[PDB]
Design an enzyme around this catalytic site. Structure first.
Site, PDB file in Angstrom:
ATOM      1  N   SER A  28       0.844  -1.192   0.000  1.00  0.00           N
ATOM      2  CA  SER A  28       0.000   0.000   0.000  1.00  0.00           C
ATOM      3  C   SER A  28       0.882   1.247   0.000  1.00  0.00           C
ATOM      4  O   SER A  28       1.555   1.532   0.996  1.00  0.00           O
ATOM      5  CB  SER A  28      -0.934   0.001   1.210  1.00  0.00           C
ATOM      6  OG  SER A  28      -2.045  -0.855   0.996  1.00  0.00           O
ATOM      7  N   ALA A  30      -0.207   4.663  -0.795  1.00  0.00           N
ATOM      8  CA  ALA A  30      -0.922   5.765  -0.137  1.00  0.00           C
ATOM      9  C   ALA A  30      -2.475   5.672  -0.152  1.00  0.00           C
ATOM     10  O   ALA A  30      -3.077   5.559   0.923  1.00  0.00           O
ATOM     11  CB  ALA A  30      -0.476   7.111  -0.715  1.00  0.00           C
ATOM     12  N   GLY A  32      -4.694   3.339  -1.382  1.00  0.00           N
ATOM     13  CA  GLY A  32      -5.399   2.059  -1.323  1.00  0.00           C
ATOM     14  C   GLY A  32      -4.564   0.794  -1.219  1.00  0.00           C
ATOM     15  O   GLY A  32      -3.417   0.814  -0.757  1.00  0.00           O
ATOM     16  N   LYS A  49      -4.788  -1.273  -8.407  1.00  0.00           N
ATOM     17  CA  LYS A  49      -5.102  -0.537  -7.176  1.00  0.00           C
ATOM     18  C   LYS A  49      -6.607  -0.413  -7.075  1.00  0.00           C
ATOM     19  O   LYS A  49      -7.253  -0.017  -8.043  1.00  0.00           O
ATOM     20  CB  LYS A  49      -4.445   0.845  -7.194  1.00  0.00           C
ATOM     21  CG  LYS A  49      -4.777   1.757  -5.996  1.00  0.00           C
ATOM     22  CD  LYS A  49      -3.797   2.907  -5.989  1.00  0.00           C
ATOM     23  CE  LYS A  49      -3.874   3.748  -4.744  1.00  0.00           C
ATOM     24  NZ  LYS A  49      -3.060   4.984  -4.916  1.00  0.00           N
ATOM     25  N   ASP A 145       4.030  17.640  -2.681  1.00  0.00           N
ATOM     26  CA  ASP A 145       4.093  16.561  -1.708  1.00  0.00           C
ATOM     27  C   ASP A 145       4.825  15.320  -2.241  1.00  0.00           C
ATOM     28  O   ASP A 145       4.383  14.189  -2.034  1.00  0.00           O
ATOM     29  CB  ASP A 145       2.707  16.222  -1.133  1.00  0.00           C
ATOM     30  CG  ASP A 145       2.776  15.511   0.213  1.00  0.00           C
ATOM     31  OD1 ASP A 145       3.837  15.611   0.900  1.00  0.00           O
ATOM     32  OD2 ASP A 145       1.795  14.835   0.573  1.00  0.00           O
TER      33      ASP A 145
HETATM   34  O1  LIG Z   1       1.681   1.262  -5.950  1.00  0.00           O
HETATM   35  C1  LIG Z   1       1.151   1.357  -7.067  1.00  0.00           C
HETATM   36  N1  LIG Z   1       1.770   0.744  -8.254  1.00  0.00           N
HETATM   37  C2  LIG Z   1       2.908  -0.118  -8.270  1.00  0.00           C
HETATM   38  C3  LIG Z   1       3.417  -0.730  -9.383  1.00  0.00           C
HETATM   39  N2  LIG Z   1       4.381  -1.570  -8.973  1.00  0.00           N
HETATM   40  N3  LIG Z   1       4.515  -1.472  -7.649  1.00  0.00           N
HETATM   41  C4  LIG Z   1       5.339  -2.191  -6.840  1.00  0.00           C
HETATM   42  C5  LIG Z   1       5.847  -1.645  -5.645  1.00  0.00           C
HETATM   43  C6  LIG Z   1       6.566  -2.461  -4.758  1.00  0.00           C
HETATM   44  C7  LIG Z   1       6.872  -3.782  -5.095  1.00  0.00           C
HETATM   45  C8  LIG Z   1       6.359  -4.325  -6.281  1.00  0.00           C
HETATM   46  C9  LIG Z   1       6.578  -5.803  -6.619  1.00  0.00           C
HETATM   47  O2  LIG Z   1       6.636  -6.622  -5.731  1.00  0.00           O
HETATM   48  N4  LIG Z   1       6.669  -6.132  -7.968  1.00  0.00           N
HETATM   49  C10 LIG Z   1       6.849  -7.475  -8.477  1.00  0.00           C
HETATM   50  C11 LIG Z   1       6.296  -8.662  -7.990  1.00  0.00           C
HETATM   51  N5  LIG Z   1       6.669  -9.654  -8.821  1.00  0.00           N
HETATM   52  N6  LIG Z   1       7.387  -9.135  -9.850  1.00  0.00           N
HETATM   53  C12 LIG Z   1       7.980  -9.902 -10.958  1.00  0.00           C
HETATM   54  C13 LIG Z   1       9.067 -10.907 -10.531  1.00  0.00           C
HETATM   55  C14 LIG Z   1       8.698 -12.106 -10.991  1.00  0.00           C
HETATM   56  N7  LIG Z   1       7.560 -11.837 -12.099  1.00  0.00           N
HETATM   57  C15 LIG Z   1       6.908 -10.780 -11.672  1.00  0.00           C
HETATM   58  C16 LIG Z   1       7.510  -7.793  -9.653  1.00  0.00           C
HETATM   59  C17 LIG Z   1       5.571  -3.544  -7.127  1.00  0.00           C
HETATM   60  C18 LIG Z   1       3.576  -0.651  -7.172  1.00  0.00           C
HETATM   61  N8  LIG Z   1      -0.053   2.126  -7.192  1.00  0.00           N
HETATM   62  C19 LIG Z   1      -0.871   2.089  -8.351  1.00  0.00           C
HETATM   63  C20 LIG Z   1      -1.275   0.800  -8.871  1.00  0.00           C
HETATM   64  C21 LIG Z   1      -2.082   0.750  -9.991  1.00  0.00           C
HETATM   65  C22 LIG Z   1      -2.649   1.912 -10.516  1.00  0.00           C
HETATM   66  C23 LIG Z   1      -2.373   3.170  -9.909  1.00  0.00           C
HETATM   67  C24 LIG Z   1      -1.492   3.213  -8.830  1.00  0.00           C
HETATM   68 CL1  LIG Z   1      -1.080   4.764  -8.072  1.00  0.00          CL
END
Ligand SMILES: O=C(Nc1cnn(-c2cccc(C(=O)Nc3cnn([C@H]4CCNC4)c3)c2)c1)Nc1ccccc1Cl
EC number: 2.7.11.24
Length: 342
Positions: A28, A30, A32, A49, A145
């Site tokens: 999470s 911010a 959701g 999200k 921010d």
């Molecule tokens: O927070 C977000 N988006 C967002 C994107 N990616 N990440 C993120 C952040 C932290 C970690 C990971 C993580 O774990 N990514 C991972 C897991 N698996 N994989 C590979 C490896 C193996 N195959 C898939 C990669 C992703 C966070 N907010 C958001 C979402 C959708 C629409 C709008 C908004 Cl603001």
């Protein structure tokens, strides 16, 4: 038959299009709950999200609506771009939740900050943050921010900013992170574009120090940390403050401020090669120009991008990308629903 299916992810039910498979929680940021998923139609991994009843109060409503609108006002590789937007609910009366879909990233910037990064990775992350902020400014968006929890990166060191900043009471338990906010935001001053440079400075400094630069319970403690380290600002800065905040600021104990070699010692950077000795001096010089209390003296986004530490990545295509009220619960619900339905 039905185009949606429901799955329990943590404590939240995700009702998503059938194209999205194998949902797994990824934290999470911010606004959701966010899941990783495989998109069987695009043959790629995505992040989903869920905005739950975003019209429930003024704060969630204003942000959900402005971010849905602002997504269409931006088009830059260092700024969030949505692959999809949907609601499983069929009518305005039934409308509850909004689902936002984007490409799956690999980590949040908070994770990256905790690692020891070389100068190539640090300068490239900062360069991308600057390209992203310059794109926002050119679209008439002054963030105010910016913080690491709203920034995501891929293994290839690629970066995206996920939110659009500031436009008030939260009845929920989630608290706001204020540590990256500029003195103009802290002191209610009025600002320009370089308000965002302070936040970049806070991020860069924390990359070097591995500790939040200006922590505090609220603005009182935070301001004390700013003045303890950077010193009391000039009388020219004081004149731009509202009378009551000015009285507060002028009556705090006076501080000389520590020099930037003292604030960010040589030990924090690699001292092996002549290349790294030079990059360390350039990094500290950039820090000294971004972490400056008075905005009239703090560097601009354009001058930060011309700084020798950043300029090695400079590309005109990446910097000159063409840029294209209060309501009740009921009113916010329809405004949001209309944006969702387009
Ligand atoms: O927070 C977000 N988006 C967002 C994107 N990616 N990440 C993120 C952040 C932290 C970690 C990971 C993580 O774990 N990514 C991972 C897991 N698996 N994989 C590979 C490896 C193996 N195959 C898939 C990669 C992703 C966070 N907010 C958001 C979402 C959708 C629409 C709008 C908004 Cl603001």
């Amino acid at each position: 038959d039905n185009q949606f299916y429901s799955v329990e992810v943590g404590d939240s039910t995700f009702t998503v299009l059938k194209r999205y498979q194998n949902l797994k929680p990824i934290g999470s940021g911010a606004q959701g709950i966010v899941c990783a998923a495989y998109d069987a139609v695009l043959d790629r991994n995505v992040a989903i999200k869920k905005l739950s009843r975003p019209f429930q109060n003024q704060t969630h409503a204003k942000r959900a609506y402005r971010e849905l609108v602002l997504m269409k006002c931006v088009n830059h590789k260092n700024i969030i771009s949505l692959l999809n937007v949907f609601t499983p609910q069929k009518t305005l009366e039934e409308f509850q939740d909004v689902y936002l879909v984007m490409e799956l990233m690999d980590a949040n910037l908070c994770q990256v900050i905790q690692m020891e990064l070389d100068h190539e990775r640090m300068s490239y992350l900062l360069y991308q943050m600057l390209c992203g902020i310059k794109h926002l400014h050119s679209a008439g968006i002054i963030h105010r921010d910016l913080k690491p929890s709203n920034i995501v990166v891929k293994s290839d060191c690629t970066l995206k900013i996920l939110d659009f900043g500031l436009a008030s009471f939260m009845m929920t338990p989630y608290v706001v992170t204020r540590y990256y906010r500029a003195p103009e935001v802290i002191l209610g001053m009025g600002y320009k574009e370089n308000v965002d440079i302070w936040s970049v400075g806070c991020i860069m400094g924390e990359m070097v120090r591995h500790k939040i630069l200006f922590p505090g319970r609220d603005y009182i403690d935070q301001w004390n940390k700013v003045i303890e380290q950077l010193g009391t600002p000039c009388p020219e800065f004081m004149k731009k403050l509202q009378p009551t905040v000015r009285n507060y600021v002028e009556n705090r104990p006076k501080y000389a401020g520590l020099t930037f070699p003292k604030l960010f010692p040589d030990s924090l950077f690699p001292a092996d090669s002549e290349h790294n000795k030079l990059k360390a001096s350039q990094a500290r010089d950039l820090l000294s120009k971004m972490l400056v209390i008075d905005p009239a003296k703090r560097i601009s986004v354009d001058d930060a991008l011309q700084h020798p530490y950043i300029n090695v990545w400079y590309d005109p295509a990446e910097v000159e990308a063409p840029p294209p009220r209060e309501h009740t619960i009921e009113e916010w619900k329809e405004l949001i629903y209309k944006e969702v339905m387009n």
